[PDB]
Amino acid sequence: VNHNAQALNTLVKQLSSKFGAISSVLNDIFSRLDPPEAEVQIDRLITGRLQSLQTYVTQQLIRAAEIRASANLAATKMSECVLGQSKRVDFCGKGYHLM
Amino acid sequence: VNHNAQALNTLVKQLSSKFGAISSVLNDIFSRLDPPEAEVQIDRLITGRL
Amino acid sequence: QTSNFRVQPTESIVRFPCGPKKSTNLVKNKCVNFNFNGLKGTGVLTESNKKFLPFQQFGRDIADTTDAVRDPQTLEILDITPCSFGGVSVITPGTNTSNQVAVLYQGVNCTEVPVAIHADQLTPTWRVYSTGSNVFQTRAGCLIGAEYVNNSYECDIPIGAGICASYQTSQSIIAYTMSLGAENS
Amino acid sequence: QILPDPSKPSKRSPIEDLLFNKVTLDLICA
Amino acid sequence: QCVNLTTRTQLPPAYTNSFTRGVYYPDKVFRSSVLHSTQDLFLPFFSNVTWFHVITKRFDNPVLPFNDGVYFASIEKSNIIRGWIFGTTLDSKTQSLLIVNNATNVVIKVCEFQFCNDPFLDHKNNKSWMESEFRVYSSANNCTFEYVSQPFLMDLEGKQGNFKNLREFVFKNIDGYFKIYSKHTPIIVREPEDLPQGFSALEPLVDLPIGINITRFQTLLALHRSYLTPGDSSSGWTAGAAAYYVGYLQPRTFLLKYNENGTITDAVDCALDPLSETKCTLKSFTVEKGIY
Ligand SMILES: *[C@@H]1O[C@H](CO)[C@@H](O)[C@H](O)[C@H]1NC(C)=O
Ligand SMILES: *[C@@H]1O[C@H](CO)[C@@H](O)[C@H](O)[C@H]1NC(C)=O
Ligand SMILES: *[C@@H]1O[C@H](CO)[C@@H](O)[C@H](O)[C@H]1NC(C)=O
Ligand SMILES: *[C@@H]1O[C@H](CO)[C@@H](O)[C@H](O)[C@H]1NC(C)=O
């Protein structure tokens, strides 16, 4: 819960970064200037926000692989420790497993 | 040991890359140019190292 | 998924503190466009109870987004809730079998569905009497075009929060609470 | 302590009640 | 025109410590129950803050420099500290700023005034301690800006009793633009040595677009004279117990704890000690056991 809320708060706090452009507000780019020279500033903002989104999605994929390894272990423990009695040492607790 | 050392040598040899900027030494950009038109190559270097 | 649901501003309020050249009105409880002293944006201007420390003019949330603005001449504290943002999700049984669909809106009360999709020419003109009947409110949004039953079946198409949907029986789309298995003692 | 308790409206065991209370889940609107 | 004042007593400066004081609001924004990191110009926590005292006759009117903004404070009972001058030359050659906070009007004037070099605050006081003479400047040649804000009201009586007022003032120069923050609060009678430990936030009051160059400042007093005060306008005066405190501002980062009402109730200085620096890099006001 802490990692998910932390990654979402990082992603919403990266909307106030300029990434080298003059502002983080799009209407202030479309006011105060002209569109063929504001065009490179909004390409800078769009590429910065796209890299922020892509680097969010990559850590979500890595953490989803970690949660999937844990869930496969929990399904194995439910099949082998709950639905039967296990002979494997220290798989279902310390000592000789009963249930 | 080989993959860790090889990744660290890749990271330290990527400090010689210009990434389209005019140089790779920072004081070369900060001398001999006006800083409003030197800021763009600094943004290119800071992005490419990042 | 087809992310479509964007509700739209009905009017604009460019209220100024009894000054520069004009003031318009104060509006509540509806999706409007606001420009309080150069604060252009779209929101719902419902009132609030926040003590606002009289020199201060702006309010922010956790994520530094503009949250509560005072009235500039009435001096009353009003929230900003931008009216926006759903996702359209489409339930189909496969196009070889039928061509009728059901539509889920992901996060809304659909007391306030019927207003808008608006991008280029996608338009309210489907919606103005397609709200009608077969409106069912779930905890995953609300669902239009499917009829709720009290039977409990296996899951066929998963809507969410324990609700599934299927296509059977004058054929139609039904939505039901999914069943876990046969009861046994 | 592991079988479901029929007094409470959520039919959970007492141990499942402590496991639900000890995990604590506005930033959600932002 | 003025006559130059004499019989001044030169003393070494008595120092003290700034017990978590001088934290204002940098922005016009209400925030609720958040912790915000502000990089601004503050008085650092536990800083080395100067003290001057006025009762020969213990005359403290120094010419102090204004480098990057000044915390000014006074624990006071009968409104002796009433004014300020600012500027570089102060002798009608360059623009000089003047703030006078009297019982009539808060008067701000920006002009080439020919100030008296140690200005008269004469105050020919009978049973009503009223100001009868005002010899601070003498001339005005060619100059633009004058302004009067809303005053607040003072008794103008020669009280010799207990201190209850704690005045707090912050003066800043950003982009040719003068900011005055304040907090006036009641204080308990204590041992009359220093300002106590406590925390209070400082709402902005007076914001003005002057745009001149300010290098030094100097405090304008309000001396009181009576029938126990024999002498002329330069030697014979007995004021009574008053004190003021000068602290200097530095570019520092702070961590601010806004409450649910928008008033910041606790701050963390960020380069004081490593525990508070750990609190900076965690963005929290309590730190769990470990290594960071
Ligand atoms: C949705 O509508 C119901 C019915 O009035 C109401 O009780 C509920 O608070 C509404 N929720 C939201 C998020 O609008
Ligand atoms: C079927 O469901 C509807 C709505 O959920 C309910 O009003 C109705 O009473 C139900 N029918 C029976 C027989 O329970
Ligand atoms: C302030 O600095 C001076 C340095 O001359 C020092 O003597 C004095 O003790 C300091 N004050 C405190 C409270 O440490
Ligand atoms: C502000 O403080 C007061 C007194 O502590 C109290 O009413 C409340 O805690 C806060 N909020 C509001 C809205 O009054």
Author numbering:
A (entry chain B): 755 to 853
B (entry chain C): 755 to 804
C (entry chain A): 311 to 479, 492 to 507
D (entry chain B): 607 to 631, 651 to 655
E (entry chain B): 14 to 68, 74 to 310
Publication text:
Among all SARS-CoV-2 and SARS-CoV proteins, the surface S protein and its RBD are critical targets for development of effective vaccines. The S protein comprises two subunits: S1 and S215,16. The RBD in the S1 subunit of SARS-CoV-2 Omicron VOCs has a significantly higher number of amino acid variations than the RBD of the earlier SARS-CoV-2 VOCs, including Delta; nevertheless, the backbone region (truncated RBD) of the S protein is highly conserved.
Cryo-EM analysis of the S-6P-no-RBD protein indicated that the S particles (with truncated RBD) formed an open conformation, and the side and top views showed that they were missing the densities corresponding to the RBD regions. These data demonstrate that S protein without the RBD was capable of forming conformational structures for insertion of a heterologous RBD. The RBD-truncated S backbone protein forms conformational structures for insertion of the heterologous RBD fragment. The rationale for selection of the S protein of an early Omicron subvariant, BA.1, as the backbone of the vaccine constructs is that this subvariant was dominant during the time of experiments; also, the sequence of this S backbone region is highly conserved among the S proteins of different SARS-CoV-2 strains, including Omicron subvariants. All vaccines induced IgG antibodies against the test proteins with varying levels, and S-6P-no-RBD induced the lowest titer of such antibodies against WT-RBD and Delta-RBD proteins. Unlike other subunit proteins, S-6P-no-RBD induced low-titer neutralizing antibodies against SARS-CoV-2 WT (50% neutralizing antibody titer (NT50) < 1:500), Alpha, Delta (NT50 < 1:100), Gamma, or Omicron-BA.2.75 variants, but not against the other SARS-CoV-2 pseudoviruses tested. CD4+ and CD8+ T cells from all vaccination groups produced IFN-γ or TNF-α cytokines after stimulation with S-6P-no-RBD protein; cytokine levels were overall higher than those produced by splenocytes from the PBS control group. By contrast, S-6P-no-RBD-immunized mouse sera generated low or background neutralizing antibody titers. In comparison, lower-titer or lack of neutralizing antibodies induced by S-6P-no-RBD resulted in reduced protection and pathological changes in the lungs. Therefore, although S-6P-no-RBD did not induce, or elicited low-titer, neutralizing antibodies against most of the pseudoviruses tested, it did elicit specific T-cell responses, leading to the protective efficacy against viral infection.
